Every structure is written in C-alpha cells, then in structure tokens.
Amino acid sequence: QDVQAFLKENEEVIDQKMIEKSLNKLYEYIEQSKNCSYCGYHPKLVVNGRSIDIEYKKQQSLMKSMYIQQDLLGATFQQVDISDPSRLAMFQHVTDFLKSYNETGKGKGLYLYGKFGVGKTFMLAAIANELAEKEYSSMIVYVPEFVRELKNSQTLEEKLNMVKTTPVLMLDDIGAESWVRDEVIGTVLQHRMSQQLPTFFSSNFSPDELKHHFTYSQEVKAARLMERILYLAAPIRLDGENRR
C-alpha cells in the first residue's frame, strides 16, 4: 500500500521499472525514521541515473526557514499596497488558486524579476503567511548566502535536502560571490518537475540578465540553469519608486 502511494507521488519522476529496481531503497526509506533529532538529518529520495537513492500569529510555528534573520518574515496582504504592474497584474495568478492547491498535479509559482531595492521579496514573504493560514513547512532563503558554507567540506554529503521538494520554497536574492552549480541547483530544480511540485522566486536582476551572467568560459550551462527557473510559471514586472 505504501508503494502505491509513493509510486503515484513520484510517478512523474519514476519509470515504473525504476521503482521496482529501487524497491529496496524506497522500502527502506519509508521503513526508517522519516524524522531527525536536531528537531540531525532526514532521508529524501533522489534519482541518480537509473537508480533511486536516499540522501540525507499562531501561523508562524512549525516552519523551517534556512539562513535568514529571525523576525523579518512577518508580512500580510491588507498592509501590502496595490500599485503598478508591480501589484495589479499578479493578484490574477495568486487568487485563482487559493484554497485549491494539490500535490499530484503541478501548480503555478512566480518569478519576481526587476530592480535593486523596490520590492523583490514582499510578494514571497507575504504569501508565506497564506502558506501560514494553512501552515506549510514553507522555506525562505538567501541564495547570496548559500554558495559559500556549502562549498565548505566535515559535513557536506547532504546539505540541500530542505532546498528541493518542500511543499513551498520562496527563493529570495542571488546577488553575490560551467559553474559550481550544474550538479547542484540544476538537479535540485529537477526534483521540482517530476515529484509534483511548484516553487517561488525573487531576486536582484532579471531572466535576460541572469542568462547573460551565469557560468562563463574561454558552454550552454548558463542557458539551462534558468529555464529550470522559467517552466512552472511566466515572470512578470516590478515597477515603482525606491524604498530606502
């Protein structure tokens, strides 16, 4: 019965036969502790070639945000002002889906792309409390502070297991430091498209810019990192006066 559940859960990723081949793994996966003791790791399934392996208000509570300041993550929707195509062409993809969000059927996220300061992350931290009216283990992260300590080493076998297939991922900022990121997030964004999952984005630049800036050499490994980030959704503008 567990196999049935898992099969259909990841049937977008698994090749029926792959499931039966990695049966031992998936069965050992469910049989062991699905939790940890730091709350130090938890088991998650990953597809490696042809085999599946196992790698390790009263609304903001059981959440587990990574590498972020403690109390900045409190934002609502009445308080969020409604302005330009920064906020009048977005509440058309946000509200069509509210109390209607499935797993076993991919959903539409968003990619907030634009300037340096206006309002990158106020439409990924506000909705993280719509993902707090129902309460998901919604992740909120600084990717400027993510390609540094995970280059380090000690512990490194499994460091991004909460940055893959969590019910929600409100990715914020990537503006610091053929890249050290093609067997990393480029295969992280692979499990966000075959185990039935959507993700959330916001950063400093834009789709056109980021493709022209990633991975350089003397190789289209710079123009494959970013359609792993232009698939589940269509990016829309952010415009308005400065906020500093």
Added chain:
Amino acid sequence: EAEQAVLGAVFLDPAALVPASEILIPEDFYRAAHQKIFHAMLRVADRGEPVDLVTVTAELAASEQLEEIGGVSYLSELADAVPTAANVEYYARIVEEKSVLRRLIRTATSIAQDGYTREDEIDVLLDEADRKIMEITGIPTGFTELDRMTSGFQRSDLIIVAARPSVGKTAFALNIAQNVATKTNENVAIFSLEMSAQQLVMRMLCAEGNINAQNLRTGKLTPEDWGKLTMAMGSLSNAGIYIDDTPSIRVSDIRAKCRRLKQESGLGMIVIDYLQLIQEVSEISRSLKALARELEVPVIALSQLRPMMSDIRESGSIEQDADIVAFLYEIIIAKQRNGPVGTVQLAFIKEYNKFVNL
C-alpha cells in the same frame, strides 16, 4: 508433611482444584490412606456438582471406603493445618516434589536387575529402559495514548524490557514513570544500581523544559532557557521520585526495602535496574514476580539486551510466569499479559530527549 496439610485448603473455596487437578493424580500418593480419598473428591466436581466439605464424606460412606483412613478423625485432620493463605498454588507442589522424583526414579529399579534377569537382550534392553525416565484503568505508562488497549500497569505485574544496548529503553523504563509523581500525585519508586543518584538529575531537565539543544553541562545556557525552565525541578519537591544506587542490592533486599515506602506512600511503581545486574534465570528472576502480587506494586524488574521473545527467554524464564514483555527497536508489545497484545506507533526527536507518537 504436605499430605497432612494439602487437603485442608482444597476444601473451602470452592475452587482449590483448578491448579490441583493439574498437579496431583491418583498415582501421586506415597501414603495408603490418602489415595482413595482424593478419588472420592474428584468424582464430585464433574457436574459439578456442587463442591463442599461433606459432598465427599458421604460419598466415601457409599462406595467402599470409610474406616480405611482411621475414621473421620484424620479425615478432619486433612483440614487442620494450613496456617497460611497468601502462598496461592503452592503447596500441592510439595506433593509433586514428592512425585516427579519416582516417575524419574522408580523407573530405574528394573534395570538395576535387567542384567542378571534380562540377561539375555542388550539392545532392546536400551530402547525401552531409557524411555521411561522422562515421565487508564489501570495506571497509564505516562501516555495519554497507551490508555485504551490494555491500560496499566494496573495493580500488580512483572515487566522485563530488552532493546539494543543502552538506548531509549534506558530512558523509557523511567519515561513510563514520569507523569505520575508530578503531573498527578502517586509517588513512584525508581531505584537504580548502574546509573547513580549523581547521574539521573541533569538529564530529567534535558527531558523537561525546552532545554537540551545546548547543552546543560557548562552551568549556564543561552538567553532563553533561563526564561523557559520552571518545569524541570520546581515541582520536584511536591512530586515523589527520588534516586538511589546501593551498588547492586540482591533480589531479597530491595524486595525487603520496598516496605519502608509501602507503609509510607502505598508504593506505586518499582522501576528497577535491569534484573541482570541484580544478584539460570527461571530461578533468580522468580523473586520479583510475586513481590508485585503481595506488595501490590508495578515492578519494573528489567533486562539488558533485538528484539525477540524466546531469545530473552534463552538462558532462563521469560515465556512463563513473567507477565507483559514488550520489544523496543516503536513499542512492540508483541507480548503483554494484558489482553490486547499489540504495537503502538511512536518516534523520537533526540533533540530535547522527548519521544513522539503518531
């Protein structure tokens, strides 16, 4: 001197034959006056039919047997002894320990002669001559969950836990006995022999206060665990759990030490150090099963091991008089002298020493 006494108790029950029909048969008679008496007893309770003193005495007057025993004078003195009651079985075993012998001993007399009489045979003189020889109710375990299958830990049992070497059972045998002294009332005796009195104090606070991701050994924690602590030791006084380690006190001594408290508090639980460090086990461990029955205390007289049953039932008892026996790896109570023998879904954080359910 069993036979002089044994019948006395059997009399006034009317059910001192339930284990006694199991123990003694019409062969179990060293004596001569006694053998037909019991057959006049056994003929009765087969309807049955009813059971009392006399239903046998006028039965004996009938089918050829009354002076055979010297009148009713000794038929009276079958009764006149048993200066006791709290034994239980017990007792008829004395007669069975006058019995078992000769079913394994009277069967070796012919042979002692089957060499100068049966001269004359040899091999078949073995095939047969060796054959004969043989012949919440119900106090919870702390949980609000383990409260509806069996319930208790009621009022009297023997419990012996065996999981992988020194794990969370080490915690659990005692994490059975937590929500009883502080969070309700009943003072529970948790004595020790391995983990001393100066070894079971800092880690109950690890188990209580939202304080353990630190840890607590350094003296001073972080600016939060002192704002959130008054849970761990504040009500410890008005509770009722205290710790001892009289090196390794024997099976009679603690058995005789749980008499200070049985008068004082009533004695609620006895969480003992593994009955294996206490001083081949179907013998030594049979002095804490019955202490539960008279002292009226749940007695956690334990073990130190995978888990499997006739595997701790290996060199000793365990699958016998011993009551409920669970199996930690999820609590696999694949044995519980309790009724609903079953597994309860659980887990563990290991972060703040607090265990989980589902």
